[PDB]
Amino acid sequence: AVNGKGMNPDYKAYLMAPLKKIPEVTNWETFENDLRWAKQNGFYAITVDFWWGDMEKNGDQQFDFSYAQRFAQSVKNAGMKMIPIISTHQCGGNVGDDCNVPIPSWVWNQKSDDSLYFKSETGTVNKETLNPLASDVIRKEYGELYTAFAAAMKPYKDVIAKIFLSGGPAGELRYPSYTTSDGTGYPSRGKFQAYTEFAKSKFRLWVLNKYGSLNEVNKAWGTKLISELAILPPSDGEQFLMNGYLSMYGKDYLEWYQGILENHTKLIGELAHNAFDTTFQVPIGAKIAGVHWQYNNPTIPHGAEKPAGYNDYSHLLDAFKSAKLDVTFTCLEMTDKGSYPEYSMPKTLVQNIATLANEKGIVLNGENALSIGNEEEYKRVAEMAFNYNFAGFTLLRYQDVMYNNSLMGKFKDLLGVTPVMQTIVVKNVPTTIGDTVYITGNRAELGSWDTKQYPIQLYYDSHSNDWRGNVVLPAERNIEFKAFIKSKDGTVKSWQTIQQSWNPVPLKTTSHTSSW
């Protein structure tokens, strides 16, 4: 893996459940059997959306966790684990959606202003999820929902391996900047979503709080605003993305804009921990979307990310570490293109996000963006997952592998692996002062024969004069590898004489000894 390390020893594979309720897809007995089968193929738990629109439909405080409970009951019967997603967002309207579950219709009546929803540069209204600006309503509603959920699901704490939160549209921490009705669907640039009267005044107050007065504002932005009402979000999103973002005003606007999402992260993170920490004691996480298009568009750089709310990922991730939430990213199955008109750079994006996450010590979990239909995409996922320290991978979605035995068999082999620590020992290595020994192998878990970025470092044992190291490997899988020497300057000097192998790696920790 990266930095001479191996795959993450805590890696686990997860299966994303269907969007529709199980009873609308099959019966509970078949479902329980599907889970036993999934478990046989390396899946540790099934992640599932529990829609707010279902749990509090009737009215405020009128809960119904009957479905969630029945679902957990079957997971328990199958001897599996589940990862509930407290989806406070709407189901339907997004890519891949095949459901229709809006958030409780009554929530919109708790306000007379327009503080609850989103309005784009061109007036398009969006009600897929509560606007994070309304922290007062979110604190109340999410606070109540989470605590009610904890009580109702207390009896099943033993099958709950983790809890996910929905930070926005599609259960992702972001603004709804890419939608069909707003004319911002892939691969178009996104449209900023801060045009409600509430958003405008909030930005105005934030600017005034930062600088004190209009004069200080005009002084900082080098502008000539006539009055406080002139403090506004971009009038022209396109022009802003072309070069307005480079000005002092742009920096402040984007800081505030992304700031709303960071503050929201800290809020839900706190409500969640307060409601689940003592009861379940399981990790909590949220999702960041993979807005990979328009990444390298020369005219409007990061034209889709910025409107989504992603301007500074480093700063964004700090909010997660601060809130004590694990992070989930996507697009692990895709590769870079970066050509007109999409200017798509998913892999580059995933690599950057992963590098940042690992630096800050944030637990990283990945997902695939679109359904996978060929073994080749599983390989791409494997490369990213096992070389960028992912602690987990969640496959979307259920039916894709449940009704396709050959695809399932390929996932079991490449991704449904159980990591096991093994000691590799290489003897008689002709190393000279300054050289370092590494091992690289055929599977992604071994860097796929890469000696530049993904090789696994070994350590000299001065006592037995050989090189060794405890390496994490995929249990019960066949592997081939070779040790090689890296000069002090970083070039590959020589390779092990014979290619080694372990057919397969045993599930018990032992050691593999070979000679150079």
Ligand SMILES: OC[C@H]1O[C@H](O[C@H]2[C@H](O)[C@@H](O)[C@@H](O)O[C@@H]2CO)[C@H](O)[C@@H](O)[C@@H]1O
């Ligand atoms: O609130 C100040 C001003 O902001 C916007 O104008 C920005 C523009 O969006 C940027 O791309 C760049 O040109 O800097 C401008 C400020 O000097 C709003 O469009 C404008 O209405 C508002 O008054």
Ligand SMILES: OC[C@H]1O[C@H](O[C@H]2[C@H](O)[C@@H](O)[C@@H](O)O[C@@H]2CO)[C@H](O)[C@@H](O)[C@@H]1O
């Ligand atoms: O690069 C893929 C390739 O890597 C290894 O081949 C090594 C070989 O082991 C060394 O002795 C020397 O020849 O450099 C080669 C790399 O060019 C694997 O052994 C091989 O299976 C794999 O395809």
Ligand SMILES: OC[C@H]1O[C@H](O[C@H]2[C@H](O)[C@@H](O)[C@H](O)O[C@@H]2CO)[C@H](O)[C@@H](O)[C@@H]1O
């Ligand atoms: O079931 C989980 C969520 O699935 C969809 O959202 C996915 C989307 O399909 C995928 O392309 C993207 O990369 O990630 C999101 C979030 O996992 C539904 O649209 C969501 O409502 C579900 O919560």
Ligand SMILES: OC[C@H]1O[C@H](O)[C@H](O)[C@@H](O)[C@@H]1O
């Ligand atoms: O915008 C939703 C979807 O748009 C496109 O299909 C992208 O390829 C995909 O990665 C993304 O999830």
Ligand SMILES: [Ca+2]
């Ligand atoms: Ca409530």
